[PDB]
Design a binder for this molecule. Sequence first.
Ligand code: HEC
Ligand code: HEC
Lengths: 126, 126
Amino acid sequence: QFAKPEDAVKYRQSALTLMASHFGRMTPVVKGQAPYDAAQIKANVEVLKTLSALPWAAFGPGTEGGDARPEIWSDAASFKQKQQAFQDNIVKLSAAADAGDLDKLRAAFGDVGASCKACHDAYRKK
Amino acid sequence: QFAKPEDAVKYRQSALTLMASHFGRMTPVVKGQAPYDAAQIKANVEVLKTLSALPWAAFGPGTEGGDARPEIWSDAASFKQKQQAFQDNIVKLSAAADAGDLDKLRAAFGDVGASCKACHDAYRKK
Ligand code: HEC
Ligand code: HEC
């Protein structure tokens, strides 16, 4: 599916756009500005869980480009920790959504949000 | 998540790009040009199943734009049949992948492929 480095860029950008939508639409619920519907959130966090695993296979060998910094590949043990933290947080998010526990959800939502930013600060271009 | 019609366009384009990748990467397997690994295909068709439900919520009221024809909304009972056929085919695809049955997979892959094209012929711009 990633014939040239550009195809990898196009895929990973599309997956990240969809995780942003699926993550970002839950903001009003975790802030108490919308009613919490536990089954709907459980379904939406299942979509997000699936989407959250996809970008990372499109950052393989030789796929520099986009708004990706080069340090993704020159500091790859570091990048990998910034991806694992984020996928670790998605596990948390799922555990709270599956339990129907809003306070835990709200907590795991903020862990997720911070890990998004920590990777962007270090490995995404302005 | 779709504040303006453009946000709906951007989301639906990203979801369709990812379904194309996840659908299109199985071509060599269904054509016998790559070995069939039933568990890996089962996992990939699970990703595709999840992705295949997403575009359609971003074609709601008042989200004309992109390479979407207007007839999506002026002939909406017709568009809806072209989406149901495609989602019906994804069910088939999943049933074969979950069974590990390559011939049925290959058949359901071609039903999927045709339904992609039938909708594009009728409701996507050149
Ligand atoms: C590294 C471990 C990252 C984590 C965790 C997250 N993102 Fe990110 N994101 C990353 C990179 C290197 C890039 C640029 C990709 C490129 O090749 O251009 C991005 C990009 C985005 C985008 C823009 C997509 C586009 O349309 O071009 C968005 C909307 C985005 N990222 C959102 C996002 C969110 C919401 C995350 C947590 C849920 C997140 N990213 C995590 C690197 C990393
Ligand atoms: C109608 C019922 C459709 C079915 C079934 C499929 N697609 Fe399609 N596709 C449709 C439209 C109306 C559009 C244009 C969207 C816009 O607003 O621009 C598309 C677009 C695509 C694209 C381009 C995405 C982009 O990057 O802009 C691709 C790669 C695509 N569609 C692929 C695709 C595949 C592989 C399908 C079956 C698995 C499929 N689409 C079904 C309408 C419909």
